[PDB]
């Protein structure tokens, strides 16, 4: 039973080694997962910052139309006092000194 009792313990050690090696495989997986779950966290933050940049990133016709109400009142005051101004200028020019 000398070489039989030992064989039992050696088998237990072999089983123990698998347990530890499995945990080492776990760690190895866990370390790659860090690189994976960070690469997914990064390009989602990249597209998100790009998203909120393009939202911010938002034409002479709009400058004329923006003042078409003033360009209309200018000709308005023009049509009224026109004939009364022209009348004075004419009289002034042809007046016998």
């Amino acid at each position: 039973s000398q070489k039989n009792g030992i064989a039992t313990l050696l088998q237990a050690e072999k089983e123990a080694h698998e347990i530890v090696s499995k945990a080492r495989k776990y760690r190895q997986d866990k370390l790659k997962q860090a690189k994976t779950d960070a690469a997914k966290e990064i390009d989602s933050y990249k597209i998100q910052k790009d998203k909120e940049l393009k939202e911010f990133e938002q034409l002479e016709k709009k400058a004329e139309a923006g003042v078409q109400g003033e360009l209309a009142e200018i000709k308005k005051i023009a049509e009224k006092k026109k004939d009364d101004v022209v009348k004075i200028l004419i009289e002034t020019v042809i007046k016998p000194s």
Partner: protein, 223 residues
């Protein structure tokens, strides 16, 4: 009888099981620590990898943002200037149409000979009184020379009544006629030495009137 022991086959198995139990237990605990530390390292490393790159992304974002925050207000500035320019250039396009009609009206007066004749006289007399020279040269439109010749006497009469202190010997109507395109009426009077001229044309008088009237009109219309 070949095994050296003081224990029953059951006893040796109780002790043999007890040892291989310890071995496995020692392995479970060792493995437990490994995967517990791996979980901690996973979090640490994931965070770091992320923070490395987020600091990079944040950097060029704020530069791109500031860049776009500048172009955003460059347009706001350029639009608000195009607006103030259109307004100003419209105020002028209107005033320069008031004076434009005024000078069409002036041409209309010149083509009414019965209305223009007394005006032309007063324009010629006023000019001669600014000269006060014994001989005066009169430049006029080619279409006015026949009219002017037929009122030389009335002109020399009216002049004598207003300037006895500086008599007028003769009026010379120059054959160098005024330009149809520049002049609609009036005359240009100069002395013989050609050192002095009085431009008393309708266009010139209005031009001089503009000097003071244009700001005045601009003030009363668009104060």
């Amino acid at each position: 009888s070949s095994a050296i022991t003081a224990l029953t086959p059951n006893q040796v198995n109780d002790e043999l099981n007890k040892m291989q139990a310890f071995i496995r237990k020692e392995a479970e605990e060792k493995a437990k620590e490994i995967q517990l530390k791996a979980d901690q390292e996973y979090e640490i490393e994931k965070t770091n990898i992320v923070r490395n790159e987020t600091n990079n992304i944040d950097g060029n974002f704020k530069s791109k943002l500031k860049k776009a925050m500048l172009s955003q207000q460059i347009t706001k500035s350029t639009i608000a200037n195009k607006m103030r320019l259109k307004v100003l250039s419209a105020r002028e396009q209107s005033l320069d149409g008031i004076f434009e009609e005024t000078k069409e009206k002036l041409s209309g007066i010149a083509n009414n000979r019965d209305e223009y004749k007394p005006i032309l006289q007063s324009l010629i007399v006023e000019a001669l009184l600014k000269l006060l020279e014994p001989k005066a040269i009169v430049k006029a439109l080619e279409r006015d020379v026949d009219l002017i010749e037929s009122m030389k006497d009335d002109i020399m009469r009216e002049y004598g009544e207003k300037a006895q202190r500086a008599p007028l010997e003769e009026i010379v109507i120059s054959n160098d006629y005024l330009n149809k395109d520049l002049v609609s009426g009036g005359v240009v009077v100069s002395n013989a030495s050609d050192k002095i001229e009085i431009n008393n044309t309708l266009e010139e008088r209005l031009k001089l009137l503009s000097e003071e009237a244009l700001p005045a009109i601009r003030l009363e219309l668009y104060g």
